[PDB]
Structures are given as C-alpha cells and as structure tokens.
Design a binder for this molecule. Sequence first.
Ligand SMILES: Cc1cc(F)cc(C)c1Oc1ccc(C(C)(C)O)cc1-c1cn(C)c(=O)c2cc(-c3cnc(-c4ccccc4)[nH]3)oc12
Length: 108
Amino acid sequence: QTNQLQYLLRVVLKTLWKHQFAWPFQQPVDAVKLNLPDYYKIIKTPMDMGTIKKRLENNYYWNAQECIQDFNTMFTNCYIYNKPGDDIVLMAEALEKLFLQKINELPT
Ligand SMILES: Cc1cc(F)cc(C)c1Oc1ccc(C(C)(C)O)cc1-c1cn(C)c(=O)c2cc(-c3cnc(-c4ccccc4)[nH]3)oc12
C-alpha cells in the first residue's frame, strides 16, 4: 500500500514462503545435518527467508534496500555453493523470478 518494508513482509515474503520450492530456504542451511564442512567457509554471509522474516518482524532493517540485498544474498549464496543445473539451483531460480515479479509492484 505505502511503506516498503510492510509490503516486503505482507506481500513479497508471504508469496515466496507459500511457494512449493520455499522449504529449503525457510531456515539456515544446517551444514552439520547435511554433511557440508566447507559451506560456512565458502559462504561468508549466509541467508534464508527464515532470518529475513525475523528481521522484518524485529525492525532490524534500516530500509527496504537492505532487506532486498538479503534476498539477493540468499539466491547468489545458493548459486555460488551449488553446481548450475542442481535441483536446489532450479528451485532458487524459480523463487528469484517470482521475487523480482513481486518487487516491481513495490510502493514509493
Ligand atoms: C533441496 C534439496 C533436495 C534434495 F533432494 C536434497 C537436498 C539436500 C536438498 O537440499 C536441502 C535439503 C534440506 C535442507 C535443510 C532443510 C536440512 O537445511 C537444506 C538443503 C539445502 C538448502 N540449500 C539452500 C542448499 O544450498 C543446499 C545445498 C545442499 C547440499 C547438500 N548436499 C550437497 C551436496 C554436496 C556435495 C556434492 C553434492 C551435493 N548440497 O543442500 C542444501
């Protein structure tokens, strides 16, 4: 409607969260459970919709552009660590496309 961060929480995040392919990005990549010793060495700034959701609820972000940066970090993190063509990458790509659709309808 008017405030940007409100939009990001109530519209953008809700849409991405409901999506079929959301579940692997709803919490930090648990690198112990998954047997990934190198993840937290390669990915300097980890990110998930879980953490973004927390930050929107907890008046953490200075402004919408900081939150959008985190969404991009989540996607690019996935594309850095994983081989192009992997299942997880196609899922990230699907969410990214939808993310960018919803970001165009953003108030100002
Ligand atoms: C989405 C998905 C499908 C699948 F069939 C198998 C896995 C591991 C998978 O990814 C995850 C499943 C669960 C979780 C939880 C919820 C436990 O955190 C995370 C992932 C997962 C999420 N993200 C964002 C990743 O980038 C990633 C990478 C891996 C991964 C696990 N093992 C590998 C891998 C390592 C070396 C060689 C080949 C694959 N990659 O798993 C995930």
